[PDB]
Amino acid sequence: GSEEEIAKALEELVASLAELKRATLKLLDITDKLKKNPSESALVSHNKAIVEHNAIIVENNRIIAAVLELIVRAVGMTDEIDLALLKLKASTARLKVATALLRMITEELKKNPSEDALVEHNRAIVNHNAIIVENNRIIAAVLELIVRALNLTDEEVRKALEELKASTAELKRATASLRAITEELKKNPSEDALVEHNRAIVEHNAIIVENNRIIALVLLLIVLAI
Amino acid sequence: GSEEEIAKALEELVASLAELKRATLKLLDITDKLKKNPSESALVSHNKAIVEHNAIIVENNRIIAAVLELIVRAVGMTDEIDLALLKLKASTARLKVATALLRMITEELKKNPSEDALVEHNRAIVNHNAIIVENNRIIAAVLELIVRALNLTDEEVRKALEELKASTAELKRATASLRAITEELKKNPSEDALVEHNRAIVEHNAIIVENNRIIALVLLLIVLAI
Amino acid sequence: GSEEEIAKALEELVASLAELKRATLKLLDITDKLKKNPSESALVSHNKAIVEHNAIIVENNRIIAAVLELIVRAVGMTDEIDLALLKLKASTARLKVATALLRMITEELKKNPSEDALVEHNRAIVNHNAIIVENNRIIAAVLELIVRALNLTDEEVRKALEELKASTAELKRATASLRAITEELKKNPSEDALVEHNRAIVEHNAIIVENNRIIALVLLLIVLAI
Amino acid sequence: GSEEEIAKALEELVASLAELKRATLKLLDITDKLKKNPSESALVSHNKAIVEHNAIIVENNRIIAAVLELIVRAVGMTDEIDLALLKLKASTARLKVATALLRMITEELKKNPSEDALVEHNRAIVNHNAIIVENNRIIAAVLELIVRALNLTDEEVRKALEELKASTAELKRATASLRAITEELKKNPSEDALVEHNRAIVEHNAIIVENNRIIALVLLLIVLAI
Amino acid sequence: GSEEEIAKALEELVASLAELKRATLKLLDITDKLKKNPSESALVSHNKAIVEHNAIIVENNRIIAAVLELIVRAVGMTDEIDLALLKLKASTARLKVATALLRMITEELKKNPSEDALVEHNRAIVNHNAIIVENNRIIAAVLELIVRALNLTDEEVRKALEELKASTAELKRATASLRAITEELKKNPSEDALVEHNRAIVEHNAIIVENNRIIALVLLLIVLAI
Amino acid sequence: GSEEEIAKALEELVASLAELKRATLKLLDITDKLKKNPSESALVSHNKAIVEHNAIIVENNRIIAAVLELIVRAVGMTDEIDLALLKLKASTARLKVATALLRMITEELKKNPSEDALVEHNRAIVNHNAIIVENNRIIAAVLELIVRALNLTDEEVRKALEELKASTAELKRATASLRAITEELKKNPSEDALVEHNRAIVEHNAIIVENNRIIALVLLLIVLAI
Amino acid sequence: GSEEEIAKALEELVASLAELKRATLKLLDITDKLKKNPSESALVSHNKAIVEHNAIIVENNRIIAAVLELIVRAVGMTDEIDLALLKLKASTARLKVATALLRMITEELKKNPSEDALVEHNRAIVNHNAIIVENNRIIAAVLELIVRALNLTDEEVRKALEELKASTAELKRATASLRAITEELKKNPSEDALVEHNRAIVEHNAIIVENNRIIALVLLLIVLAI
Amino acid sequence: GSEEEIAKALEELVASLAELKRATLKLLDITDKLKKNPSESALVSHNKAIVEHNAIIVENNRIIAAVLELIVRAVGMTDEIDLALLKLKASTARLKVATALLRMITEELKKNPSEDALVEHNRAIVNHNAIIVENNRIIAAVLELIVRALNLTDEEVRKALEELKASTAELKRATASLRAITEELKKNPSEDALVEHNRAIVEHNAIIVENNRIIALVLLLIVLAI
């Protein structure tokens, strides 16, 4: 597309980030304290603020992938970029099936709510998060490819990639740790461990959002450098 | 909606109740005594204070239904609550056609005013009242559902429901009695029976307002308990 | 459509009637007396208040036909109802061409205003009225069909149809009388006969509005009975 | 097509006429007076309001021909009607090439603007007008054929044809006069004669629009009589 | 097809399930209570909400079979899978003739409505339900084949099959019970038994929809595992 | 807002405090002694001077929260301040529903006045006080945040916070003690305990007003330090 | 657009200038003197009045470009004007990405505020200023093109262009000087140099506003001359 | 609009005239004598009482044009009236750009005040006056058209038009004389000629206000004659 289409898509992107950061802060805050004990309606909506947060992350990743396509179709594909973009499309398609699965098990929780089903639902949320991390690792690979293809040596871009790589490794380590503790919850299913597992989820979602922030930065520094 | 939207809608609700209670008392007072006999212009406006009262009750029920939707869309729907809310929307739509019919026959009384048309107009007012009672019985069913879904066991709520159920049965009995006497008026149409039928209407409107008062109470006790 | 769509369309209908009755009364009042003699600009706008009234009647008939379609598509078509609805659509299409013709001859009166063209314009208004009467006779046939199909035996509906039939025959007789006097105007074209023919038009428009009032009543009694 | 399709196409037709009459009046008004002398940009847009007017006439004629096809395909073709419709299609195709030629020479005037090229452009506008007159003479022949085929003897139609024939002869005489003066401009090319030739164009466009008005009238009187 | 085609088809599938569950709930709700007795138009539309529900189930099964074909054409056919897919195509073709038969007998009920024809129509609905159960038993066989072919041993899939088999046996037992009671209705045709047979239909449709839910689940767990 | 808007809002605040301190002193004085025994009209207005005092406290808290928003929207939000301000808005919204509930139970006391309903009304006043204490604990948290964010180290501010914290802990202890004695009144309902419970209410209101005095001080010392 | 649309857009333009001149004067005044040393909250909002000023300049340039499009679409495009307008659209799109980048780095300063990040933020403000200067140089080129195309020889316009060109060269020289000193700050990062670099920014913003003033003047003199 | 809207707009008109006549008299009086010599602040506000007077004339003309539109939209447009009203709208739009230009050059006089800029500002005031005269000549043409269209032959109206025409020619002659002397000032710029040119401006403003008086009279005589 032309410059105005990319600029409109980047305004949609930065407004989506400004919405996702507020929702992240409020989800940590409602994760912080509550003395009182939950209702039956608090089973029917067990984790609704997390599934609603993940949906915003998935919508942010879809826009990032649409901007990457609009950029590359401007600067011109090469073999390796086209292979990486096709991988990115296959991963974005996988994310739709993973979302429709989480959105099914969440509604099936309206009908067999029980302390065991709550652990199944939490494991479904961990598997959705583990697939969002893959989508981000592919988008970051496509971006490093586009930056090398343009021979784009500005120090702002260099430093923004040096930050993006470290944020990607931080997100890998956090995902492996979340799956490790989720196995321990699978061994020892309890309300006591469920309460402290919900925090581990919210603290992994925080790292996802702190990675999408850098992906949007590198996208801006590229569109300004071209 | 957020807490401020429900709080604003409940301020609109309680101010509407404080207006409707004054109008109820004044409508009984102007029902109590008048020696002098009516004019021709007192045919053209035969019952205007009753139709003006019913319009306020219909406007109060619309606000109650908007608060119920804002609450349930916060605490989260379930199959039976969502079915009951859809019933409540269908009944609130029925109430609009019943109001527009009463507001047509009232204006048709400007053009064929006669001692027979006055009995038709009174029967239209009784059928409007009989449809407002249905709208209240659906709102009370939705409220008892929401209270059970929240597992809301406070004694203030328990006692407020124990009052709401008895007021609903009192209103059913009063509606059946008003239609029963309205059949006797349909048999024996006279000014003598018209005068004593108007009181039966005003004494049924009093029970409607004494029911909306308890519906607004239970709505407050719920919003304070969440 | 669902109950809320029909209820919104009936609120649009009754508000359109309350606008059309006021415009009818004011058009009779401005038909009643004026001593002073008209200008040249009173040729360029010879009957503008009548053509503006007819446009409101045509817009009211369009809404009535949209409600009839929304009702029948809820309760279910049968062979004879579907044939009658297709007739109603063909007549509502004819009414659009008749309106665009009256709205052309009215503007052609801005450019050859003369005492002869005024008689052409009055005959165009009579032919528009004669086509609105047909549209009402088809809508009334569709309504009597729907009432028989629902086996809807309430006395309120029976009496409202007994009124609708008499108003339809009154409107047939008034249309034949208006066309009869319009032939006499065609023989004896004069300002003197133009003045007394304008009243005959306004007294036929009054019967059209007194028929739409009953069509809207029967529509309400049906939607309340289902 | 069915009655509703013709009625929609006639609403498009009459709205197109109401737009074309306003554009005609404003084009005469901007033809009336201007003291000040034109710029170089007033060469680059030498006659833009005429070419923009002709485009509206061509779009009105396309809709008239689409209504004629929808009518005849309803009432049934005959040998002479089908021959005349095929002639009308060949002339409407010729009009597209004549328009694309005027729309080419107008843009070639952006690149060799000179006092000689302005006279070429004016002659191209006269040749476009001379081809629109042919399209109108074929549409008027098709209409007189359809009216005779229906044996449609109403006096409104008879008088509307008696007007259409005279307007067609008036348009023939005006086209021959415009071509005659255009030859005199071709002999004596000057700004002085260009100014008075532009008026002759605007006064021929006025007769075209005053002919399409009658073609649309006869189309309405036909669709109302069938 | 590619990953994006299956992902689009699974979004269509899960949205179709979310529409079919709402229609199931509303069909039970309109099965729950109604005091008043039906009209003649309530013969002309005797079971319309059931035939409209079955049409949605048939449209959901068509999409499930299209996803199964898109999956198997990706992972690769084998003899037994290709035989089972050809069986599935033959059953999906049979379902089209069974639907067109129900859609014929329903319209023949517009023309000989009688208490005997209502029992014929109910038996046609039972035979349609009995053929949808077969289509589900073939789709479930194809799915168990595909799962074994992929050697797909995840516990989420294992448990989802352990649920699918039990739901298939529950649906067989419910179909045999519905046919058994349909024989008793065939012996004792009455409005009294018709009312309680309609409930047996709605309670069998509920089990069909509770089976399609599990077929769509297993389809998601497969597409995520491949 | 600009300096003049904050200065006007602080003049409104200090004038509201000067009204609330006088009303507190007079409410203690009318709590001190009265020999004579109350009327029936002294049931209909059982505690009116307390509910009228609480309404003034609620209006002072509303102004404090509007000044806090005007200050922070000048000096610039940060994550933790914006979260705390949103908590403050949710609590100020909760206070409106708690007020409308107290203002309902007070008017319901006009209609079933009895020695039992008086204990219900006193418990409603205690629950309103328990919600005002929460609103103050949120405002005091927001103020300590703003003071740390400005790095505002003046000794006047430090000492004013050292007073505000101690007053907040004094108010927590007084609220827990008031609820404890209110439970004992709920066990032992008597005029004898009602008389000594009214004093406990007035002595808790005194601590609320002695806390708003310090909140208004810290607000002034902040607006003067920036 | 018509004359009223351009006149409305020029009223929006001149009101935007009257807001931007006041903000320029006040930003110099708050740049002039302050003895006291900044807080931690004075890091979180380090330059907020500059970024808020730049946003107003960007909004003024958007309106100027909308007026240029409305003017040229009235007087008629030519090759060079249409190329220059497409350049102006591409530069206005670039300005949106540059703004969203400045609005990101400013918010990232809420989370890693440090003496090094403040120098990054100051360099981001210098790069935003360097892109606004480009947008102004393109708008001034479009205006000189439109003035030559209209052959607009008035002495007010001639002198207004002679001022616009000199102001554009003054703004080029000031931008090169600001980038030169920004390199020296990049070498020698200190609070001491940050304080004197902030003045260089405010003294470049003053020249931008003193250029937008002349662009709006030439736009008025053009719209009055056509 | 209805009679009350026109009557309110004519009350606004006559109150605006009563304010403008007082301001005219006082502006002549402060133009009459002052011995003492002006300050530097008497450069920064060189002609402020004239520009403030012109703003009142422009606001009076806006109301006159709004009343003309409300009148004609009541009595009904014709081709020539509609063309003249569209001209009046284009001229009223031109007057806004001419005002915003005068209001820019007046403020630019705060920043380069010098004996040469004062002559520029006086020439800007003369060009604004020359555009108000055009707006008045269009309003007077529209009024003479409306009077002929109503065939309004009263002698009060005839004589009021006979006055309006002479006042319009007097205002044309005065404008040509003011521009003639303004050319002589442009040749011979001096304080001596500036002092005597300011009087020529004030003596032209007097004729504008003495023309608006007659336009408001004719507007009243028309609204009273219909």
Numbering used by the authors:
A (entry chain R), B (entry chain O), C (entry chain Q), D (entry chain S), E (entry chain T), F (entry chain M), ...: 1 to 226
Anything the authors wrote about it?
We carried out a second round of sequence design to explicitly favour the designed fibre packing arrangement over this alternative, and identified five substitutions to the charged residues at the second interface. Two substitutions (V29D and L82D) knocked out the D1 interface (Fig. 2c (left) and Supplementary Fig. 3) and the other three substitutions (E32D, E33K and E87K) favoured the originally designed interface (Fig. 2c (right)). The N terminus of the subunit faces the inside of the pore with the N-terminal helix interacting with two adjacent subunits, the C-terminal helix interacts with one of these subunits and the C terminus faces a loop from a third subunit. The helical symmetry of DpHF19 is one-start, relating non-contacting subunits with a rise of 8.4 Å and rotation of −148.9°; in cross-section five subunits form a ring, with inter-subunit rigid body transforms as indicated in Fig. 1b. The resulting overall architecture can be viewed as a right-handed helix composed of two identical, parallel strands with contacting subunits. To determine whether the pH transition midpoint could be modulated by design, we made a version with three additional buried histidine residues (bringing the total to nine), referred to as DpHF19_9his hereafter. DpHF18, DpHF19 and DpHF19_9his disassembled at pH 3.5, 3 and 4.2, respectively, and all reformed when the pH was raised from 3 back to 8. The pH transition is thus reversible, and the pH transition midpoint can be increased by increasing the number of buried histidines.
